[PDB]
Write an enzyme that holds these catalytic residues in place. Structure first.
Site, PDB file in Angstrom:
ATOM      1  N   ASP A  45       0.955  -1.152   0.070  1.00  0.00           N
ATOM      2  CA  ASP A  45       0.038  -0.061  -0.276  1.00  0.00           C
ATOM      3  C   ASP A  45       0.911   1.232   0.022  1.00  0.00           C
ATOM      4  OD1 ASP A  45      -2.521  -1.295   0.118  1.00  0.00           O
ATOM      5  OD2 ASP A  45      -2.551  -1.457   2.148  1.00  0.00           O
ATOM      6  N   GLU A 120      -5.302   9.547   4.845  1.00  0.00           N
ATOM      7  CA  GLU A 120      -5.545  10.349   5.739  1.00  0.00           C
ATOM      8  C   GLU A 120      -4.737  11.595   5.747  1.00  0.00           C
ATOM      9  OE1 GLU A 120      -2.350   8.930   6.561  1.00  0.00           O
ATOM     10  OE2 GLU A 120      -4.222   7.334   7.096  1.00  0.00           O
ATOM     11  N   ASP A 147      -3.126  15.168  21.519  1.00  0.00           N
ATOM     12  CA  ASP A 147      -1.899  14.897  20.794  1.00  0.00           C
ATOM     13  C   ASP A 147      -2.212  15.140  19.431  1.00  0.00           C
ATOM     14  OD1 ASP A 147      -0.700  13.673  23.000  1.00  0.00           O
ATOM     15  OD2 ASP A 147      -0.522  11.641  22.238  1.00  0.00           O
ATOM     16  N   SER A 155     -11.561   4.894   2.320  1.00  0.00           N
ATOM     17  CA  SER A 155     -10.661   3.924   2.129  1.00  0.00           C
ATOM     18  C   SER A 155      -9.376   3.914   3.035  1.00  0.00           C
ATOM     19  CB  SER A 155     -10.019   3.537   0.657  1.00  0.00           C
ATOM     20  OG  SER A 155      -9.363   5.104   0.614  1.00  0.00           O
ATOM     21  N   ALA A 159      -6.747   2.443   7.913  1.00  0.00           N
ATOM     22  CA  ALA A 159      -5.337   2.777   8.205  1.00  0.00           C
ATOM     23  C   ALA A 159      -5.032   3.267   9.412  1.00  0.00           C
ATOM     24  CB  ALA A 159      -4.911   3.523   7.181  1.00  0.00           C
TER      25      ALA A 159
HETATM   26  C1  LIG Z   1       4.002   4.200   5.423  1.00  0.00           C
HETATM   27  N1  LIG Z   1       2.535   3.836   5.548  1.00  0.00           N
HETATM   28  C2  LIG Z   1       1.923   3.516   4.141  1.00  0.00           C
HETATM   29  C3  LIG Z   1       0.747   2.698   4.369  1.00  0.00           C
HETATM   30  C4  LIG Z   1      -0.291   2.233   4.495  1.00  0.00           C
HETATM   31  C5  LIG Z   1      -1.541   1.630   4.525  1.00  0.00           C
HETATM   32  N2  LIG Z   1      -2.731   1.932   3.980  1.00  0.00           N
HETATM   33  C6  LIG Z   1      -3.748   1.191   4.430  1.00  0.00           C
HETATM   34  C7  LIG Z   1      -5.033   1.289   4.247  1.00  0.00           C
HETATM   35  N3  LIG Z   1      -5.735   2.199   3.568  1.00  0.00           N
HETATM   36  N4  LIG Z   1      -5.819   0.329   5.172  1.00  0.00           N
HETATM   37  C8  LIG Z   1      -5.331  -0.588   5.645  1.00  0.00           C
HETATM   38  N5  LIG Z   1      -3.662  -0.751   6.007  1.00  0.00           N
HETATM   39  C9  LIG Z   1      -3.176   0.241   5.370  1.00  0.00           C
HETATM   40  N6  LIG Z   1      -1.843   0.239   5.459  1.00  0.00           N
HETATM   41  C10 LIG Z   1      -0.956  -0.395   6.079  1.00  0.00           C
HETATM   42  O1  LIG Z   1      -0.630   0.263   7.195  1.00  0.00           O
HETATM   43  C11 LIG Z   1       0.757  -0.082   7.897  1.00  0.00           C
HETATM   44  C12 LIG Z   1       1.463   1.129   8.117  1.00  0.00           C
HETATM   45  O2  LIG Z   1       1.961   1.908   6.859  1.00  0.00           O
HETATM   46  C13 LIG Z   1       1.342  -0.769   6.701  1.00  0.00           C
HETATM   47  O3  LIG Z   1       1.284  -2.175   7.001  1.00  0.00           O
HETATM   48  C14 LIG Z   1       0.405  -0.770   5.454  1.00  0.00           C
HETATM   49  O4  LIG Z   1       0.666  -1.700   4.622  1.00  0.00           O
HETATM   50  P1  LIG Z   1       1.602  -2.184   3.656  1.00  0.00           P
HETATM   51  O5  LIG Z   1       2.471  -0.910   3.198  1.00  0.00           O
HETATM   52  O6  LIG Z   1       2.799  -3.067   4.362  1.00  0.00           O
HETATM   53  O7  LIG Z   1       1.164  -2.788   2.379  1.00  0.00           O
HETATM   54  C15 LIG Z   1       1.993   5.216   6.056  1.00  0.00           C
HETATM   55  C16 LIG Z   1       0.305   5.058   6.326  1.00  0.00           C
HETATM   56  O8  LIG Z   1       0.436   4.262   7.731  1.00  0.00           O
HETATM   57  C17 LIG Z   1      -0.524   4.503   8.517  1.00  0.00           C
HETATM   58  N7  LIG Z   1      -0.238   5.005   9.871  1.00  0.00           N
HETATM   59  C18 LIG Z   1       0.715   5.845  10.424  1.00  0.00           C
HETATM   60  N8  LIG Z   1       0.774   5.678  11.742  1.00  0.00           N
HETATM   61  C19 LIG Z   1       0.148   4.741  11.986  1.00  0.00           C
HETATM   62  C20 LIG Z   1      -0.410   3.974  13.372  1.00  0.00           C
HETATM   63  N9  LIG Z   1       0.169   4.519  14.283  1.00  0.00           N
HETATM   64  N10 LIG Z   1      -1.248   3.151  13.206  1.00  0.00           N
HETATM   65  C21 LIG Z   1      -1.594   2.593  12.329  1.00  0.00           C
HETATM   66  N11 LIG Z   1      -1.448   3.101  10.980  1.00  0.00           N
HETATM   67  C22 LIG Z   1      -0.787   4.367  10.976  1.00  0.00           C
HETATM   68  C23 LIG Z   1      -1.194   6.174   7.781  1.00  0.00           C
HETATM   69  O9  LIG Z   1      -2.330   5.646   7.188  1.00  0.00           O
HETATM   70  C24 LIG Z   1      -0.188   6.559   6.660  1.00  0.00           C
HETATM   71  O10 LIG Z   1      -0.841   7.175   5.723  1.00  0.00           O
HETATM   72  C1  LIG Z   2       2.504  20.328  31.147  1.00  0.00           C
HETATM   73  N1  LIG Z   2       1.749  19.069  31.970  1.00  0.00           N
HETATM   74  C2  LIG Z   2       1.644  19.018  33.599  1.00  0.00           C
HETATM   75  C3  LIG Z   2       0.742  18.129  34.179  1.00  0.00           C
HETATM   76  C4  LIG Z   2      -0.288  17.714  34.510  1.00  0.00           C
HETATM   77  C5  LIG Z   2      -0.896  16.961  35.303  1.00  0.00           C
HETATM   78  N2  LIG Z   2      -0.586  16.009  36.233  1.00  0.00           N
HETATM   79  C6  LIG Z   2      -1.946  15.331  36.241  1.00  0.00           C
HETATM   80  C7  LIG Z   2      -2.384  14.234  37.097  1.00  0.00           C
HETATM   81  N3  LIG Z   2      -1.325  13.360  37.775  1.00  0.00           N
HETATM   82  N4  LIG Z   2      -3.578  13.854  37.209  1.00  0.00           N
HETATM   83  C8  LIG Z   2      -4.599  14.503  36.519  1.00  0.00           C
HETATM   84  N5  LIG Z   2      -4.319  15.707  35.871  1.00  0.00           N
HETATM   85  C9  LIG Z   2      -3.224  16.044  35.848  1.00  0.00           C
HETATM   86  N6  LIG Z   2      -2.349  17.060  35.132  1.00  0.00           N
HETATM   87  C10 LIG Z   2      -3.017  17.966  34.264  1.00  0.00           C
HETATM   88  O1  LIG Z   2      -3.135  17.640  32.989  1.00  0.00           O
HETATM   89  C11 LIG Z   2      -3.052  18.594  31.789  1.00  0.00           C
HETATM   90  C12 LIG Z   2      -2.115  18.649  31.140  1.00  0.00           C
HETATM   91  O2  LIG Z   2      -1.032  19.237  31.729  1.00  0.00           O
HETATM   92  C13 LIG Z   2      -3.297  19.981  33.035  1.00  0.00           C
HETATM   93  O3  LIG Z   2      -4.528  20.311  33.083  1.00  0.00           O
HETATM   94  C14 LIG Z   2      -2.725  19.336  34.310  1.00  0.00           C
HETATM   95  O4  LIG Z   2      -3.324  20.376  35.228  1.00  0.00           O
HETATM   96  P1  LIG Z   2      -2.913  21.875  35.827  1.00  0.00           P
HETATM   97  O5  LIG Z   2      -1.087  21.667  35.290  1.00  0.00           O
HETATM   98  O6  LIG Z   2      -3.353  22.639  34.823  1.00  0.00           O
HETATM   99  O7  LIG Z   2      -2.847  22.117  37.099  1.00  0.00           O
HETATM  100  C15 LIG Z   2       2.464  17.866  31.629  1.00  0.00           C
HETATM  101  C16 LIG Z   2       1.686  16.623  31.910  1.00  0.00           C
HETATM  102  O8  LIG Z   2       0.679  16.449  30.840  1.00  0.00           O
HETATM  103  C17 LIG Z   2       0.133  15.048  30.479  1.00  0.00           C
HETATM  104  N7  LIG Z   2      -0.066  15.118  29.064  1.00  0.00           N
HETATM  105  C18 LIG Z   2       0.655  15.153  28.106  1.00  0.00           C
HETATM  106  N8  LIG Z   2      -0.099  14.826  26.914  1.00  0.00           N
HETATM  107  C19 LIG Z   2      -1.360  14.545  27.256  1.00  0.00           C
HETATM  108  C20 LIG Z   2      -2.375  14.276  26.616  1.00  0.00           C
HETATM  109  N9  LIG Z   2      -2.550  14.108  25.227  1.00  0.00           N
HETATM  110  N10 LIG Z   2      -3.453  14.110  27.223  1.00  0.00           N
HETATM  111  C21 LIG Z   2      -3.546  14.109  28.483  1.00  0.00           C
HETATM  112  N11 LIG Z   2      -2.432  14.399  29.344  1.00  0.00           N
HETATM  113  C22 LIG Z   2      -1.516  14.831  28.673  1.00  0.00           C
HETATM  114  C23 LIG Z   2       1.487  14.321  31.068  1.00  0.00           C
HETATM  115  O9  LIG Z   2       1.176  13.310  32.094  1.00  0.00           O
HETATM  116  C24 LIG Z   2       2.310  15.320  31.248  1.00  0.00           C
HETATM  117  O10 LIG Z   2       3.217  14.930  32.515  1.00  0.00           O
END
Ligand SMILES: CN(CC#Cc1nc2c(N)ncnc2n1[C@@H]1O[C@H](CO)[C@@H](O)[C@H]1OP(=O)(O)O)C[C@H]1O[C@@H](n2cnc3c(N)ncnc32)[C@H](O)[C@@H]1O
Ligand SMILES: CN(CC#Cc1nc2c(N)ncnc2n1[C@@H]1O[C@H](CO)[C@@H](O)[C@H]1OP(=O)(O)O)C[C@H]1O[C@@H](n2cnc3c(N)ncnc32)[C@H](O)[C@@H]1O
Ligand SMILES: CN(CC#Cc1nc2c(N)ncnc2n1[C@@H]1O[C@H](CO)[C@@H](O)[C@H]1OP(=O)(O)O)C[C@H]1O[C@@H](n2cnc3c(N)ncnc32)[C@H](O)[C@@H]1O
Ligand SMILES: CN(CC#Cc1nc2c(N)ncnc2n1[C@@H]1O[C@H](CO)[C@@H](O)[C@H]1OP(=O)(O)O)C[C@H]1O[C@@H](n2cnc3c(N)ncnc32)[C@H](O)[C@@H]1O
Lengths: 261, 261, 261, 261
Positions: A45, A120, A147, A155, A159
């Protein structure tokens, strides 16, 4: 017609490519990698995704075919043994075409840049935390902190979208699907949580609030954009056209890929 | 035109109903609960679901309106204060109609019985374990073991479907969505896990393997069926028609219901 | 005893800090930011996390206190109004101490570097795809491909761990919890999916297979490590000690933070 | 010592049972199914669960052994080929015992009834909607509306708990884990969503608000209780004791069961 063949690069793919060109040579078929009407991808793919973007400006003049040398793919869904049978049916013509919807991404600066995705497009945290305002048809829907976000074609739902909890959509549905990457949900921050499935003409807009740098990806192309103020997602008016030569239904492709071949 | 009004039954809903009938009385409007062209539901979504099934055999001759006396609903999305304004616009006419897709369920015995759902239809374990074969367009897709399955309309994706991890679908998409209820996934049993979004004309069939008794639900109607051998799901050809009098978009209804009004 | 106060930096936190120092001045209390026995954090959990790492080498000689100037936190769980009441009870002594478990991370090169985490430590894709071998007590458990992994302390389970689907663990449980970030699961790649809760003395080891660069984070400290061959996770023998002055139970802190205060 | 053997009932299990009794006959071993010190289960985990509840009143005087005639189980983790080797080591003695925590359930009426669970205890909707108040150590934590709740032992986290999104816990952790079954979360209803891991001495109490009938299950025993007003969950003081004769670690048992044997 004009045709071309792209390869993963390893020994197996390069050699199947050289055998199809040989089989193609005995026909009214000219190898042409500038203006092909038939683009065959040999590999996986990812090889097919590279082939699609290599020709995204001639989508309406091209039918795509995917051959998987490794495991079964969703775009490379024909195995090498039928390549000789593939040469013949490609030569005469007389094959229906299948069309899958695409996702259009618009990125605005402070000029703009548009892109086309087969799987995507994702938006990610540039280094510091990721906070964006989500706007649906000019209405503020939610303020997302997490994140990142992923907007998937039908299609593409098998993925990255599938790994993020999204639903698998049949590609005949002209839609796009948005999923969250690890969002915060507390008394301060609130997101919908569920994946959202949008139809044609619906415009999802991502707007920054604090930082303005983001890691924007489109299929395997991922570049960091600077001084952005809007990322617009929309079901594209363009479609990718596949050459079809027998019935390999989508839900069967799903079964063989995820349940057991 | 002919109209009728149904009520949740409490004091607030019965009294708003009696005030709208009074407002309706001063017009070329006849209260008729046998062959209405306008069905107003006062209460909640459950009151509206009861109103829909009360008239599911005259869907193409009826426009539905929902008034919520409690919290905001997805079908009861107009509040009581605008009922007097609602009477007027219902009287003249001149209002667009909105159509949402419905889900058709077919249950076969060893005769058959069909049903129509506005939210979803679920199949559940009758007492012992729940094992069914999932068949998509006559292909065996998976053998499911778990608590049950849920097939949802687009407008139903915010209901039970949302609690099971499904995606929220805009109701302009003619589709149906299948989600799993607590499935087993080990070296013996394998399910897809992701929700599946099916288009029109796609037929999902559930077939028993061991026990043949099941708890089948359609919206709030849940009855135990005996000696079944097939449950067929399919996007219905019928649609529910809503009377529309101003713009209350779906994604805004989602925002107000799940993010904060 | 020796004490010190750290501040988020804004006007509200700096001024509450200057008022507590004033209240502390009328006591047998010396402000000392080199060898404190009492570390007060004013701001949020992030301010507290900075205060913890500022003194992670004197954990057994320090009792921590958190004051939240904004919303309620899990480490900053006392509001400003009780700071004057806080000064008094800190001065006399006579307060139980509460201990939470910590997570130890070991990163080996080809020398090594160890770290201590109060919330979690995450390992992420350095640029290309993320593939690591997961080893539990020297047994190969799975080959993970996805966005990354997160190993969380008990008190960290409400942070990043909660957003990744992990379970909330009471901090009296000496354990660590591992969660996946968007893993691939198809016929080629297989991961457990569920979060894993490990006890003391259990060593989880992450080993690269292809690329050897990774984005390793420990709480808010995130640095890219090069030429790594092992990341070892283990419940630390050290604990963070909190000064306790009244009952604010964990599940109540969870209720107030996620249900409604 | 006194021993007994239970069987799934099919031809393979009954015959392996008759061969072990024969092997046991040539030893200082008396078959006794009233007061055994050794209980061997031949079949699967369900056969073992039946064997556990058959002797739950003599848990501290019994060591359990599980033999799987079908696929590998988590309690039946020795295959038939080693039964003759199993007879010998059971005869002499000299084997360490392994202890797993159990879950205690208390059900009060308006008298009470207590139960002991090896996997989990679940509370479910009796027919109408399921609404319960969740109380943790006498604090109101949340009002849950949904399909039901599941409280799992550590060894039970790979069972029903895993299907509901719970974390897998190593059985050396004296804890219990609560997971939700399809909860509603809107502007009206709010639940924590995440699984909750509780330590010893923590009491989780489920209290009805509207209906008072519930489907309460304990392992495979599921009976409908009437006129209940409280369901109390608590890590039991009793433990199940396994006879151990070689190292088959838990995370390896997880790997073999869910990744690939
Ligand atoms: C380098 N690849 C090419 C491809 C493809 C890709 N497209 C699809 C699709 N439309 N339906 C299902 N399976 C798919 N595949 C496979 O998926 C794996 C990851 O390539 C491989 O086996 C692919 O297969 P093949 O290349 O080994 O044959 C980038 C793509 O990876 C996807 N991707 C990125 N991060 C994640 C993640 N964390 N989890 C899952 N998917 C992720 C994202 O969509 C990106 O476009
Ligand atoms: C800058 N922060 C400080 C803090 C803290 C933190 N620790 C905790 C904890 N132990 N239990 C619950 N709530 C918590 N907080 C809050 O969470 C938010 C993100 O700070 C804020 O409201 C925090 O609150 P306050 O700082 O605004 O008061 C880094 C932390 O962020 C976390 N983190 C990173 N990425 C993600 C994500 N994608 N989703 C969720 N959490 C994430 C990770 O754990 C990292 O250590
Ligand atoms: C008695 N109800 C009527 C209604 C409605 C209903 N339909 C919808 C809908 N389409 N989009 C969003 N919200 C909806 N609502 C609300 O949902 C709650 C449960 O009624 C109530 O607030 C409803 O609201 P209102 O009646 O209090 O105003 C049966 C329905 O319950 C659903 N349902 C059953 N079991 C669960 C579960 N475990 N989790 C979530 N939903 C479940 C299922 O779909 C069924 O048709
Ligand atoms: C009749 N069973 C006996 C057993 C066992 C059981 N206990 C465990 C366990 N502790 N760790 C992992 N695997 C386990 N097993 C297997 O699980 C399947 C369902 O038996 C079978 O393969 C079991 O295996 P074996 O009997 O075929 O050898 C009732 C149990 O079913 C569980 N359960 C109920 N409903 C669901 C559901 N919807 N999803 C997942 N599990 C569910 C629940 O916990 C209950 O105690």
């Amino acid at each position: 017609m004009k045709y071309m063949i792209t390869s993963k690069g390893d020994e197996k793919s390069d050699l199947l490519r050289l055998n199809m060109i040989a089989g193609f040579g005995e026909y009214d078929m000219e190898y042409d990698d500038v203006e092909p009407e038939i683009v065959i991808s040999i590999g996986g793919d990812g090889t097919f995704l590279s082939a699609f973007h290599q020709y995204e400006e001639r989508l309406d003049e091209i039918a795509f075919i995917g051959i998987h040398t490794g495991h079964l793919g969703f775009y490379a869904d024909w195995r090498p043994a039928e390549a000789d049978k593939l040469v013949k049916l490609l030569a005469k013509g007389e094959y229906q075409k299948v069309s899958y919807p695409l996702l259009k991404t618009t990125v605005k600066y402070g000029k703009e840049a548009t892109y086309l995705a087969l799987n995507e497009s994702t938006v990610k945290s540039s280094g510091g935390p990721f906070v964006v305002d989500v706007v649906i048809n000019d209405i503020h829907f939610e303020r997302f902190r997490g994140d990142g976000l992923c907007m998937s074609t039908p299609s593409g739902t098998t993925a990255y979208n599938k790994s993020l909890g999204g639903a698998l959509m049949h590609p005949s549905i002209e839609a796009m699907q948005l999923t969250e990457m690890a969002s915060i949900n507390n008394r301060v921050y609130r997101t919908i949580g569920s994946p959202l499935v949008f139809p044609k003409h619906h415009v999802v807009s991502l707007q920054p609030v604090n930082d303005k740098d983001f890691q924007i990806s489109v299929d395997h192309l991922s570049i960091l954009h600077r001084d952005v103020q809007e990322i617009r997602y929309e079901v594209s008016a363009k479609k990718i056209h596949f050459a079809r030569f027998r019935s390999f239904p989508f839900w069967r492709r799903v079964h063989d890929s995820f349940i057991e071949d």
